[PDB]
Structure 1
Amino acid sequence: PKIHYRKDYKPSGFIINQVTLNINIHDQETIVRSVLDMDISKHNVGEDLVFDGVGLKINEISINNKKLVEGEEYTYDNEFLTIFSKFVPKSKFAFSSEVIIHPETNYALTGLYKSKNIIVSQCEATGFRRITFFIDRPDMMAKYDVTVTADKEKYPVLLSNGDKVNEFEIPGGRHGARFNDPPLKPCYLFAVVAGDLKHLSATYITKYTKKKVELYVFSEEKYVSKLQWALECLKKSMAFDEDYFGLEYDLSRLNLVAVSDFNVGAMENKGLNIFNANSLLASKKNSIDFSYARILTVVGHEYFHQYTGNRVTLRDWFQLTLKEGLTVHRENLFSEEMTKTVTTRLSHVDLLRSVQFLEDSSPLSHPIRPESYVSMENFYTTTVYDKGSEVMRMYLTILGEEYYKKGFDIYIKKNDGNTATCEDFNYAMEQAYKMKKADNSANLNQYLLWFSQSGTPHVSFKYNYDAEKKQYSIHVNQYTKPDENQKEKKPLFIPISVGLINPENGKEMISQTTLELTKESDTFVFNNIAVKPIPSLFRGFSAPVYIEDQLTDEERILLLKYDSDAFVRYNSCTNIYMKQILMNYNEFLKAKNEKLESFQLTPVNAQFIDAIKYLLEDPHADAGFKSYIVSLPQDRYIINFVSNLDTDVLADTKEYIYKQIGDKLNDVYYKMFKSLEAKADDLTYFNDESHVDFDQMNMRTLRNTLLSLLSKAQYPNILNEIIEHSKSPYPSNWLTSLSVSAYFDKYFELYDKTYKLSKDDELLLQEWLKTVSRSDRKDIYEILKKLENEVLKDSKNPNDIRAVYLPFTNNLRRFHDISGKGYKLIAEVITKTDKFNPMVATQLCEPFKLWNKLDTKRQELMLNEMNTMLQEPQISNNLKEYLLRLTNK
């Protein structure tokens, strides 16, 4: 297993100036002819000419139109094509080859493959080598001339990068299309699409140069009615980059294409963005509410790549976070601006502190710029993406909006058209930092540690207030636990957005302030503070850290009710919950360990419950925010704070706490559920696909959250509501009716009803599968078997497989069954999947990421299944490398 180190980057000894492709698609095979106009670089030392090439069937390879002979002129081991230096020209030459590939049987969805009746490519990161020979790395920039030929009635629409410069008929019912793309690009941005595609279209006129841009969104004919929202999102995306960053699109046309089989959400191929259907297609009748935020995010994300990734590209894959962290950040700014709801920011903090914090304390922990990799197909992590985005966001927090826009523009203008590294971005940010602090001595050298240091920092606080002096002090400390990446952790540049709240009237006591913590510890002093304040710390979650506020629950309740920052309120509620959870947890744990016949539990803080009621009953309070405060922290967030977690005890803890709050607030819950119905389920714009109300969807979220709480509590005659709910036109509602009916005998009745509603829409059925998978059923294992036999079968669609199993793995009490049958089940699915799609197989490994955090019994159970998987003879390099690192081998 070859290990690539970041320190070992060297430019190639070769140059590829021009690529000329002929891709001829037939039913049983695809013939790929390629001419590479190449040259010798200044770093050449007379080495062999080595091309990447995986799974290629060689018909003929040549140098300068002279046929090459296999044996003494070249060798091919199905991974590398080696041409011995003796036969490699000393100056400009042409390499050519013809290979046969097989998209119809390519189930790994990398390279060229067939998704239902659409031929589609996916080349990032190392997929182009599966199509033809190439030096498959992002710093090999080349021009592209691409011709695609196929059967006309099966594949009337042909697409590739650049301008379509020719269309022509071919004897035998075939046709061809030529695409020339003069600007240089890395090969991972190459794309080709063929199929019977239908489209929606629009023309966008850019803000400053008034350039006309054609916008096309494609899908199969059956789902062409689900394309409208996507087109709107694209328009919104183009406008935002124009308005915020002053950046326009530079090409004449942009195509968006949905396919049913895709490993991730989407891909940013130049002028030809390719989407997982679930991240591009939606209609109000056939999609749940989450689809609309999802499409906005993903469409936006791939668009923003056009600058941060496509025009300014990567030198090497170790710089991945430079285009991904930055593009996610750009997407967050976009989505927060589009939704105008505080839950947008809250949701991505919620995801970070759950999933990413878990990864960062796991054996898989890595910095956002790793020092090494084996399998590139394991490189695209929540750390690189989501922690990366938070690191990119901190630049904005530190600099402020004005100087950030300055710094960002410096980055774009200086690096446009060439490759870049993380240092290039920090440099640009540093220039703005100098201008902001008004001295060229200031620097951001320490900030670079955010790129190299792994692990989540802990930030803790202590306070002093001198009433006579009117002087307030915040003593801050930071620490990162040592791991396998750094034995010794260094202090980071941590920006702490703070406010001081007067507890007597809830007013701000100081102006907007961002504390710059650059040492292991510091003391921040504030003068003329009239009264002892309650500190509002890390507003907007200004740094990706563990926040230890050391506040009393009384202080937290006061912030929850009266603070101005949405995150700090949400975090205060979170912190109150966590304290309660930890307390009830080893009360239950002690009772179990000591086998007590009787024991006591500490009740939920009564004033806390009162504060929740206060906020819920406030008509001006945000519905989305409301849904968060009545929900306990994610299981994967809680696990970060408990050693040897007994999942049964945690389940009992959550049950007690939910019941405690329910016993006091169920009447309030029911009252709100009924009073919210009118506005939440308003059908006024149900048939307007371009009208999306994120506030209204948040109202539905609240109703479905409340209904779930009421159903679990067996609230009087709540089954009546559930039945009525199932008749709602909104899928979010009638799918909710299915899941909440799990606590009643009408479950399988709604099972059949909702299935009949879902079965004729590919994406809707997958949402139905998710709903069933996450149903709180005691017979969930029997139900899964039913899904496998009657619906899933031997589908290789990643959307189907993920829908059936992933939500189930979040069933705390059932997936972590002490028999280990849950671990056994998913491991079977992983091994089965690994035989045709190694990438999705590692995705299915996610439940195991916390294995060393559980109780000793469940640790062993999980470790056994992982070792069983590791011992599969046909295990992929992909899965093997992942499980080896996860199990510390």
Structure 2
Amino acid sequence: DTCSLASPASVCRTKHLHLRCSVDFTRRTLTGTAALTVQSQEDNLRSLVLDTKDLTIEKVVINGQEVKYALGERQSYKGSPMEISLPIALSKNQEIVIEISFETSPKSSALQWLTPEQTSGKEHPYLFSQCQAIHCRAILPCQDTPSVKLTYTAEVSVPKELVALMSAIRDGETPDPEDPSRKIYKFIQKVPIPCYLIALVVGALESRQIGPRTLVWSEKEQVEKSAYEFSETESMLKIAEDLGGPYVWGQYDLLVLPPSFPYGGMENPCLTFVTPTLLAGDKSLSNVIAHEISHSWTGNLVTNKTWDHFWLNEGHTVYLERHICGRLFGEKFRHFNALGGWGELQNSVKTFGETHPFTKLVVDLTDIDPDVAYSSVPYEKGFALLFYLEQLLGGPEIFLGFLKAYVEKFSYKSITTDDWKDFLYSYFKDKVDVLNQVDWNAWLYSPGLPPIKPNYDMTLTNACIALSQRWITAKEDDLNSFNATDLKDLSSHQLNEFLAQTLQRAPLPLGHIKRMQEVYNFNAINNSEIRFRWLRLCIQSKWEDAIPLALKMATEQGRMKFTRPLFKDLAAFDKSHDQAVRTYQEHKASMHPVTAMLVGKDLKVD
């Protein structure tokens, strides 16, 4: 594991974490103890190494006495390794508890601390975590590798008017004995998980039940809207259970975060985290929920052993997601989404360049910050490989049989690409000659678009392409023929695909874009996917009226899918360049630490 400085699982492994901590909003620190139950995998083990990042270590206690530890030099985005001297040498399989008193930095990359004004209610502050990929070390000392799976329990002291939630079953609450202005929330996660799945939020939260095993959680002002948006959740769980086997996590709760949440969603066990940019008013962005649900099998049960193997998580999860959405809304819709995805892959490959190492399916992360490598490639090249295998090997019913067997086989494990490929070949031993037709070396190890494109139903895509083509080939004297009725029979998804089709050919003449606003009134659509793509098209087509709209969307939410390209478009437009860097500089301090880092790199600032 090239992204971790800890002792590998061949040396020792964490089986359990007990976390007791207090969330201090005045200092923006989390302070407490992490008791790691560690099992030796070696004879005569006398030291072990943990990952840390910007932690302050007070002391390390084993068998009731303090022990020697040392922090090595910081290795950039990897943090600093912490070597611990064991008081007694351990034999193979022996376990001990190591209890570490620690405190986080206010500047912890795993965490965003929000002032009251940054929330809906404007009364209370808010804290949230996002550990994936390698930020759990910025919360607590751990072996920060998905190659190790541990259970955990926690007790978290927070100001009594706030609520703590984690990726775990809620285990009760009480006043804090040590300070009656506080409450302690307790948590148990009894299913072994990789440490990137450890998550905390603390805020003025409320919940509403929306299914037999689902509460939606948010600040008071979003609860009603969220409950409606995510009402398909239980029915997606039922379908996911048909496809992946039993749901083993007990609860499936949803947490809708404040707008700065850096991603679409994070599949935290027991409590999925989603962006509020999903709240479109019509459930149209529900594929993200289906995605997060799917991770309860692919990712959370079968986990990538290292981050080089991240496509295992995402490709399988996108593949199950599109199946759930296919069940709900028809096989033509699965194909429409599948084809859209291939279009998103062309975009990423074009952005990075077609010989770029990040466009490889399996990546080598040696010396690479995983946050910098992150993109649509593992999702879409991964999905495209599985969609191609589906078609090669006899269709969706046959391939779903493999997917279910794959989950059973590697449940509670961490695996590599060769483990998966090996199982694939074993499962389809009667179709090995077909599998030997796959260019594996190209699919897995080569940059650029895949060597083969799957076959796609075009039914729902056609009208999108026909309209996109009308606009691109139009001349000035054709602009009059466009009318609000062009969009008549297009769903929100088709408007989005129409915009994506056209964005692929941007810039368009500025007169065309103005006409498009005149006839389609895209400025008035609040759907975040549609508005995102429409504003990108305006900025790339040099429409100055779109500049304050694109500045406003980039900074009013922080979902990096939207905030990173909007800022990048704005800096590439000469008329908005200085404003873009001005805006970033002003917002930087109150941005998500990783978001701030990546936007800065994108803009070449600092």
Normalising by structure 2, we get a TM-score of 0.80
Quick one: which of 149, 152, 155 aligns to 2:160? 152
Q: CA deviation at 1:368?
A: 0.9
Which secondary structure state, in structure 2, belongs to the residue aligned with residue 74 of structure 1?
A: strand
- What residue number does 2:237 align with? 238
1:33–1:96 CA contact under 8 A, matched in 2 = yes
Given residue 131 of structure 2, which amino acid in structure 1 is its aligned partner?
C
Rate the CA distance shift 1:219–1:770 in 2: closer, same or farther, 3 A. Answer: farther
SS where residue 252 of structure 2 aligns?
strand
* 1:59-70 pair list within 5 angstroms: 59-68=58-67
Aligned residue-pair number: 575
Cα offsets for 1:560-583 (capped at 9, x unmatched): xxxxx418xxxxxxxxxxxxxxxx
Q: Secondary structure at the match of 2:172?
A: strand
Alpha-carbon separation, structure 2, partners of 1:432 and 1:248: 21
1:356–1:387 Cα contact (<8 Å) kept: no
- The structural deviation recorded for 1:416 is 1.5
For residues 150-169 of structure 1, give each alpha carbon's deviation from its aligned partner in whole angstroms, at most 9, with x where no partner exists.
1121x1x3322333333212
After the TM superposition, which residues 539-554 of structure 1 pair with which residues of structure 2 at under 5 Å, given as runs?
539-540=455-456
Instruction: Say which of 444, 463, 467 aligns to 1:626.
Output: 463
Aligned equivalent of 1:361: 354
Residue of structure 2 in register with 1:453 after alignment: 445
The residue aligned with 1:607 is none
Partner residue in 1 for 2:379? 385
Give 1:806's aligned amino acid. P
Distance 1:188 1:367, change over 3 A: same
How far 1:135 sits from its partner (Å)?
1.3
Cα deviation code 1:622-674 (max 9, x no counterpart):
5x6323222149xxxxxxxxxxxxxxxxxxxx97x321xx645843x33xx34
Once the two structures are TM-superposed, the CA of residue 840 in structure 1 deviates from its matched residue by 2.7
* Correspondence 1:430 to 2:425: yes
Deviation at 1:146, TM superposition (A): 0.9
Deviation (angstroms), 1:322: 0.7
User: 1-side partners of 2:180 and 2:200: how far apart?
Assistant: 22
Q: Is the 8 A contact 2:51 2:137 kept in 1?
A: yes
1:61–1:806 CA distance, 2 compared to 1 (3 A): same
Instruction: Answer yes or no: is the 8 Å Cα contact 2:547–2:576 preserved in 1.
Output: no
What is the Cα deviation at residue 181 of structure 1?
1.8
Measured against aligned partners, the alpha-carbon deviations of 1:655-696 in whole angstroms (never above 9, x if no partner) come to: 7x321xx645843x33xx34865xx6xxxxxxxxxxxxx847
**1:326 paired to 2:282:** no
Partners of 2:539 and 2:573 within 8 A in 1 = no
Residue of structure 2 equivalent to 1:250: 248
Alignment of 1:276 with 2:292, yes or no, is: no
Q: Is the 8 A contact 1:356 1:386 kept in 2?
A: no
Give the Cα separation in 1 of the matches to 2:241 and 2:463: 34
1:462 corresponds in structure 2 to: none
1:51 and 1:135 in contact (8 A); partners too? yes
Instruction: Measure, in 2, the Cα distance between the counterparts of 1:348 and 1:404.
Output: 19
- CA displacement, residues 695-743 of structure 1 (integer Å, 9 cap, x when unaligned): 476479879999x99994699xx89x949x76xxxxxx5526xxxxxxx
**Judging changes above 3 Å, is the alpha-carbon distance between structure 1 residues 9 and 320 closer, same or farther for their aligned structure 2 residues?**
farther
Please, which of 168, 173, 196 is the counterpart of residue 174 of structure 2?
A: 168
The 3-state SS of whatever aligns with 2:141 is coil
Determine which of 136, 140, 148 is the counterpart of 1:140: 148
CA distance in 1, matches of 2:513, 2:388: 45
Corresponding residue for residue 32 of structure 2: 32
Closer, same or farther: CA 87–366 of 1 in aligned 2, 3 Å? farther
Match of residue 197 from structure 1: 205
Q: Which residue of 1 aligns with 2:414?
A: 419
Per-residue deviation, residues 310-365 of structure 1 (Å, max 9, x unmatched): 11112222211111111112212333443444643332222222233443515454
Partners of 2:265 and 2:288 within 8 A in 1: yes
- Listed as ranges, the gaps of 5+ residues in structure 2 are 120-124
Per the alignment, residue 558 of structure 2 pairs with 798
- Corresponding residue for residue 185 of structure 1: 193
Match of residue 95 from structure 1: 98
2:211–2:234 CA contact under 8 A, matched in 1: no
Check the 8 A contact 2:72/2:80 in 1, yes or no. yes
Residue 174 of structure 1, CA deviation: 1.7
Cα deviation 1:197-229 (Å, max 9, x = unaligned): 12221333xxxxxxxxx2011111112222134
Q: 1:699 to 1:49 in 2, by over 3 A?
A: closer
| CA distance in structure 2 between the partners assigned to 1:782 and 1:699 by the alignment | 21
**In structure 2, distance between residues paired with 1:321 and 1:398:** 20
Task: Measure how far apart 1:808 and its partner are.
Answer: 7.0
Contact kept in structure 1, 2:465 and 2:501, CA below 8 Å: no
Residue 74 (1) aligns with residue 66 (2): no
Are the equivalent residues in 1 in contact too, given 2:215–2:252 (CA < 8 A)? yes
Residue 404 of structure 1 deviates from its aligned partner by 1.2
Measured in 2, the distance between the counterparts of 1:180 and 1:823 equals: 49
- Checking the alignment, whether the CA contact within 8 Å between 1:49 and 1:88 is kept in structure 2 is no
Mapping for residues 10-25 of structure 1, pairs under 5 Å: 11-25=9-23
Offset of residue 410 of structure 1 = 2.3
Q: Give the aligned partner of residue 485 of structure 1.
A: none
Match of 1:264 in 2: 263
Matches of 2:376 and 2:553, distance apart in 1: 28
Within the alignment, does 1:735 sit opposite 2:524 as a pair?
A: yes
In 2: Cα distance, 1:283 partner to 1:457 partner: 35
Is contact 1:430–1:444 with CA below 8 Å preserved after alignment?
no
Is 1:566 paired with 2:458? yes
User: Once the two structures are aligned, what percentage of the paired residues are identical?
Assistant: 17
Relative distance call for 1:241 and 1:833 in structure 2 (3 A) is same
Query: 8 Å contact 2:207–2:223 — kept in the other structure?
Result: yes
SS at match of 2:180: coil
The correspondence of residues 602-641 of structure 1 with structure 2, limited to 5 A, is 625-632=462-469
Aligned partners of 2:7 and 2:48 also within 8 Å:
no
Residue pair 1:361, 1:456 contacting (<8 A) in 2 also: yes
- String of CA shifts for 1:100-148, please: whole Å, max 9, x gaps: 225xx4485x246447433222111112111111111112222211111
1:81 and 1:133 in contact (8 A); partners too:
no
The one-letter amino acid of 2:595's match is V
Residue 230 of structure 2 aligns to a residue whose secondary structure is helix
Counterpart residue type for residue 37 of structure 1: T
Matches within 5 A, 1:292-691: 292-294=283-285, 296-340=286-330, 341=333, 343-361=336-354, 363-374=356-367, 375-399=369-393, 400-435=395-430, 437=431, 444=436, 447-456=439-448, 494=452, 539-540=455-456, 565-566=457-458, 625-632=462-469, 657-659=473-475, 663=477, 666-667=480-481, 669-670=482-483, 673-674=484-485
1:735 partner letter: A
Cα gap change, 1:432/1:226 in structure 2, threshold over 3 Å: closer, same or farther? same
SS of the equivalent of 2:53 reads coil
Per the alignment, in what secondary structure is the counterpart of residue 566 of structure 1? Answer: coil
Structure 2 CA distance, aligned partners of 1:241 and 1:785? 42
- The verdict on how the C-alpha distance between 1:165 and 1:787 changes in structure 2, with shifts beyond 3 A counting, is closer
Is the contact between residue 129 and residue 200 of structure 2 (CA under 8 Å) also seen in structure 1?
A: yes
Q: Given the two structures, how large is their TM-score scaled by the length of structure 1?
A: 0.57
User: Would you say the 8 A contact 1:256–1:273 is kept in 2?
Assistant: yes
In 1: Cα distance, 2:101 partner to 2:495 partner:
58
Letter in structure 1 aligned against 2:370? M
- Contact kept in structure 1, 2:567 and 2:599, CA below 8 Å: no
Deviation of residue 242 (structure 1)?
A: 3.3
Q: Which structure has the greater CA radius of gyration?
A: 1
Cα-to-partner distance string for 1:48-86 (whole Å, 9 max, x where unaligned): 4211111112233222221235xxx53465633533547
Distance 1:403 1:87, change over 3 A: same
CA-atom RMSD, angstroms?
Answer: 4.3
1:188, distance to aligned residue in structure 2 (A): 0.9
Give, in whole Å, the separation in 2 of the partners of 1:810 and 1:247: 44
Deviation at 1:192, TM superposition (A): 1.9
In structure 2, the residue corresponding to 1:232 is in which secondary structure? coil
